[PDB]
Design a protein around this ligand. Structure first.
Ligand code: PRO
Length: 207
């Protein structure tokens, strides 16, 4: 899944990791996309000692599934070093260009993150409880930026959750919610917001 070209870049980033991180997949052994995700994550986890992949079979741990709100499949969530749910989730496989999203989520959970303005970080911490779904395709070039911003907010604010959704895996959901444009944010199952958005714009929408 990862060319040595990528591994050169990812090692630069993973060198910055100061805290351990756990990727927890809920694996349905009878679903091909779950097995693909397992193959992807196994290789991804091998990129750094601080990244652990753990596997739980779907429908064996209902208390955990409740705790992490596991609905869409395939599914993987991010846990911090202490074992706590960061609110960061991927529904589908974040392969192709979405590797960017997974890398940034791991970086933000396994480090202190990039220097940020007190103005921005105040607003992030000030945000109320919220659940964000970021709909993407694997070939959408502007999608990872939006995903990474929302999931960075989730990594800082304990009440914000940010779920990447590969919309091409959920065609019925695409019609229902009317995801027409390629990157789309859905907040608390209500307000749709399409197109690229800055951190400050996202924070405002979350306010
Ligand atoms: O990798 C690091 O540690 C530095 C910190 C700010 C930007 N990069």
């Amino acid at each position: 899944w990862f060319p040595e070209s990528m591994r050169q870049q990812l090692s630069g980033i993973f060198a910055k990791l100061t805290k351990k991180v756990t990727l927890l997949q809920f694996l349905d052994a009878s679903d091909e996309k779950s097995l693909e995700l397992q193959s992807f994550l196994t290789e991804f986890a091998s990129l750094d000692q601080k990244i652990t992949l753990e596997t739980i079979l779907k429908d064996t741990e209902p208390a955990k599934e409740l705790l992490y709100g596991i609905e869409k499949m395939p599914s993987v969530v991010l846990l911090d070093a202490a074992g706590n749910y960061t609110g960061i989730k991927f529904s589908g496989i974040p392969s192709g260009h979405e590797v960017n999203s997974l890398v940034l989520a791991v970086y933000n959970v396994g480090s202190e993150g990039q220097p940020l303005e007190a103005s921005l970080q105040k607003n992030i911490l000030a945000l109320p409880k919220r659940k964000i779904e970021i709909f993407v395709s694997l070939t959408c070039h502007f999608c990872p930026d939006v995903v990474a911003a929302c999931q960075r907010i989730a990594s800082i604010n304990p009440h914000v959750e940010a779920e990447m959704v590969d919309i091409s895996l959920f065609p019925e959901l695409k019609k229902e919610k009317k995801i027409m444009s390629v990157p789309a944010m859905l907040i608390d199952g209500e307000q749709m917001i399409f197109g690229s958005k800055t951190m400050t714009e996202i924070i405002e929408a979350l306010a």
